[PDB]
Write a protein that binds this ligand. Structure first.
Ligand SMILES: O=P(O)(O)C(O)(Cc1cccnc1)P(=O)(O)O
Ligand SMILES: O=P(O)(O)C(O)(Cc1cccnc1)P(=O)(O)O
Ligand SMILES: [Mg+2]
Ligand SMILES: [Mg+2]
Ligand SMILES: [Mg+2]
Ligand SMILES: [Mg+2]
Ligand SMILES: [Mg+2]
Ligand SMILES: [Mg+2]
Lengths: 338, 338
């Protein structure tokens, strides 16, 4: 389980920071990297990184879980957390967000600003530094490099689809379709958040078969679709004290699950209300959209969807888990379905 | 030679774009990637990419230069041009630049803005897409992946040093030292612009020895230091019709070679003039700094430096080229020393 390993995982971060921040000439730049790592890779729930560690423990025979192999698993879990930190620092600039993980976004900090672009790229570079230091002699080293590089390309293509569908200052209700939505979230979130951590543990355990990885992907990309729908729902209806951040999807004209569901149910009067108020900074326009979503009972539509989704994901675990332990996927379902 | 291969190299770009932009769901995002590739990876001199191709031709026996091997060399040269495009798109946002390669910077284009952050990352992702498609079965594949990843980390650490030394709105004359300068440019420019293209050709030719790569690096990082000093000089004294871009180093408070040389020669009255006018947006303050640099004959100091640098780099070619053909380094010296 995760809940137990959260403190244990977090305890390994100080060694990750020490190995990355140990040529005195670059000293000031290494001090800045330490500040970027400390600010941006801590404060989250660490679900993606913990997934690597728990899945590795469940997939590798305990007699093979020696100290060095376990250290490699913790390090690769932290690599997944560094990839997410890279995407979030940059996403927060592109989405004009204000807070993340209970504090001001890194780019909004006085003295940081758009220098955060380079800081995000340093976080991504740290992944490959750690893989070389800890994993270069292992038979799965190239599989992991390619998996992290593919996950980044996937995510970036999905970010392009997200940003193209959400132009600033242009109405884009015509592209807020279920088909467009499923394509955005599959690429921007599902691959790196669900497939990547389990696939990394699979490769570290010697499970490199195409069929085995395709079957796990069938479960995991559907779980990732639900995780992004829940993120969209919480952007507006979650409590920032719990989520750690303030939502921006309506002001940012995003193809959110909520707006997709709104358009499917709206009358022509409601469609016009959404056209006139969506995608704009004015607080009273944002409030009108939320009031429309409440008039259409979209919170009840989301709860029903969550139930139907959970049943679908469990049916996929029954179809596709074997020969992996079903616990690998059940523990991940427990973290996302609250 | 380069001058001949410029059109031949450019002719391969259409196949690079076709293989990268060939799942209809992501179609709109792939169309945007094609626009980012067309806008940002064309218009330059292609010196870094051509260096890969010319060095490969000079290092590999002609009987081994079959069509497929030559295609791999063109593709890896284009990978170096994609790395430079990634760094330049992001650098232009962080340096608040206006033009590049004779047109408005990508981020300044109406409708692009900070979405250019994700576009820059897509350019970097394309490198690894091409290396996998064209080079995965080759014995040097992992050497090239690691070389591109190291070059990126080097460059990003140097960008951190550049940005830290150049705070907006704070005087930083105390850190504009020759020692700080040499450290910034070695990491931000010399590794990716000079070592990377020659080292990539070396690995493709089977030259993977640590000693051979260290000796080439001794020449190439010094040539890269001169290339950044020339870039700094041209930021203020070059003609934008020739350089393709407008300089921003004085307004951006940069640790430019020019300001370093100014501080070494300044009287106390001149130091105060530079303190009051450097690092600020006002056009009349920028003009005062340029007038001070002219009073101190910094253009003549740069020409003398260029002569002394060229003699030093040629002495290093005599010391360290062997057993590589000296032409590999002489052709690169000819491109940078005008
Ligand atoms: O955490 P956020 O900003 O709600 C988000 O989930 C962050 C994110 C960044 C990159 C890829 N996927 C999700 P978004 O998609 O912007 O709603
Ligand atoms: O082309 P530019 O902007 O003059 C530059 O050379 C671009 C650049 C970007 C990244 C690394 N090195 C040089 P800079 O260093 O900003 O002066
Ligand atoms: Mg966001
Ligand atoms: Mg986003
Ligand atoms: Mg969100
Ligand atoms: Mg610049
Ligand atoms: Mg710069
Ligand atoms: Mg410059």
């Amino acid at each position: 389980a995760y809940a137990q390993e959260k403190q244990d995982f977090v305890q390994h971060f100080s060694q990750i920071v020490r190995v990355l921040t140990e040529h005195p000439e670059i000293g000031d730049a290494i001090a800045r990297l330490k500040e970027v790592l400390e600010y941006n890779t801590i404060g989250g729930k660490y679900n993606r990184g913990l997934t690597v560690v728990v899945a590795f423990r469940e997939l590798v025979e305990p007699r093979k879980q020696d100290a060095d192999s376990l250290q490699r698993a913790w390090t690769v879990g932290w690599c997944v957390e560094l990839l997410q930190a890279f995407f979030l620092v940059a996403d927060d600039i592109m989405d004009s967000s204000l807070t993340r993980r209970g504090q001001i976004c890194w780019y909004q900090k006085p003295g940081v600003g758009l220098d955060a672009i380079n800081d995000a790229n340093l976080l991504e570079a740290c992944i490959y530094r750690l893989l070389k230091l800890y994993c270069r002699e292992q038979p799965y080293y190239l599989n992991l490099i390619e998996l992290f590089l593919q996950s980044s390309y996937q995510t970036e293509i999905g970010q392009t689809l997200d940003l193209l569908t959400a132009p600033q200052g242009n109405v884009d209700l015509v592209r807020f379709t279920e088909k467009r939505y499923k394509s955005i979230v599959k690429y921007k979130t599902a691959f790196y958040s669900f497939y990547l951590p389990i696939a990394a543990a699979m490769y570290m355990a010697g499970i490199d078969g195409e069929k085995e990885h395709a079957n796990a992907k069938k479960i995991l990309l559907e779980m990732g679709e639900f995780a992004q729908i829940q993120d969209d729902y919480l952007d507006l209806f979650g409590d920032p004290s719990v989520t750690g951040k303030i939502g921006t999807d309506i002001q940012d004209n995003k193809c959110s699950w909520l707006v997709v569901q709104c358009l499917q149910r709206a009358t022509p009067e409601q469609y016009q209300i959404l056209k006139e108020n969506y995608g704009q900074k004015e607080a009273e326009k944002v409030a009108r959209v939320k009031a429309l979503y409440e008039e259409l009972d979209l919170p009840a539509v989301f709860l029903q969807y969550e139930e139907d989704s959970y049943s679908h994901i469990m049916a996929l675990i029954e179809q596709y888990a074997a020969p992996l332990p079903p616990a690998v996927f059940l523990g991940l379902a427990r973290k996302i379905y609250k």
